[PDB]
């Protein structure tokens, strides 16, 4: 497991090192550089179960959202991006860095065995359910989650919806307007990081 | 089994039970020194300070 962890931990740097390098080249050259896009997104609910249109009620069921303040890890693509805009005033998403993808599966990491919520406090809890996909521990699970791989669907169905608390320090002032006019709803991009460092 | 949900961020024993890498991390490696060079192109600084 450590032999896998040493490979993963050095790789997170070796991809963070190059985006340090590959921007230090272009900015000193006059070239421009779009980044490797976000492929993972993390969706946290903002509104309760009251007065939701039936069109947006089904979709949040299809994202394991059944309670206010639930985070989930879901694969981000086109057909996910156009699905989030129709539930946009009832969710909130953004890019997770490596720290939140650690602190959410170490603090509030709960697996799904026999349709029961069983925590991720032992590798044998993970080896039983996800052994057949070469996932052997939390560190294999973090790599497979955060660095999206082929089994990401088979791993996002393992973790429970991340039931979080209300953010220490509160939200912003008035909550249910789009994030780009104050408030907090819709995409938060890198600022979903500083939101999970409050609830957790 | 599992009567309490121990926290592997705030407990330093269950962390080693879950992650057999905590005996070698070195979170802060000095990958630079005094000799860091400026990498700021002229034409980028021209389009920076334009307008």
């Amino acid at each position: 497991i450590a032999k896998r962890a040493e490979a993963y931990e050095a790789e997170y740097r070796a991809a963070e090192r190059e985006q340090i390098e590959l921007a230090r080249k272009a900015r000193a050259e006059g070239n421009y550089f779009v980044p490797h896009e976000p492929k993972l997104i993390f969706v946290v609910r903002i509104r309760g179960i009251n007065n939701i249109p039936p069109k947006a009620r089904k979709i949040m069921q299809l994202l394991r959202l059944l309670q206010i303040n639930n985070g989930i890890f879901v694969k981000f693509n086109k057909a996910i991006k156009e699905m989030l805009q129709v539930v946009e005033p009832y969710v909130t998403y953004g890019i997770p860095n490596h720290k939140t993808v650690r602190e959410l599966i170490y603090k509030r990491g709960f697996g799904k065995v026999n349709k029961q919520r069983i925590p991720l406090s032992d590798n044998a809890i993970i080896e039983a359910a996800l052994g057949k996909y070469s996932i052997l521990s939390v560190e294999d699970l973090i790599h497979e989650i955060y660095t999206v791989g082929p089994n990401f669907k088979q791993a996002a169905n393992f973790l429970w919806p991340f039931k979080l608390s209300s953010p220490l320090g509160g939200w912003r002032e008035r909550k249910f307007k789009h994030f780009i006019e104050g408030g907090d709803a819709g995409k938060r991009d890198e600022h979903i990081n500083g939101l999970v460092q409050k609830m957790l | 089994a599992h009567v309490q949900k121990k926290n592997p961020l705030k407990n330093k024993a269950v962390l080693s039970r879950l992650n057999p890498y905590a005996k070698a991390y070195k979170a802060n490696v000095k990958i630079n020194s005094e000799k860091t060079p400026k990498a700021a192109g002229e034409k980028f600084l021209s389009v920076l300070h334009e307008n």
Binding site: A26, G30, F33, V34, H36, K39, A79 | -
Partner: peptide, 23 residues
């Protein structure tokens, strides 16, 4: 199967200098 979104790439500006606009 879905069409994947876009990875990164350079874009050179020797023949295309960024012009400055105003709203």
């Amino acid at each position: 199967q879905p069409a994947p979104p876009a990875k990164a790439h350079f874009v050179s500006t020797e023949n295309n200098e960024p012009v400055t606009l105003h709203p």
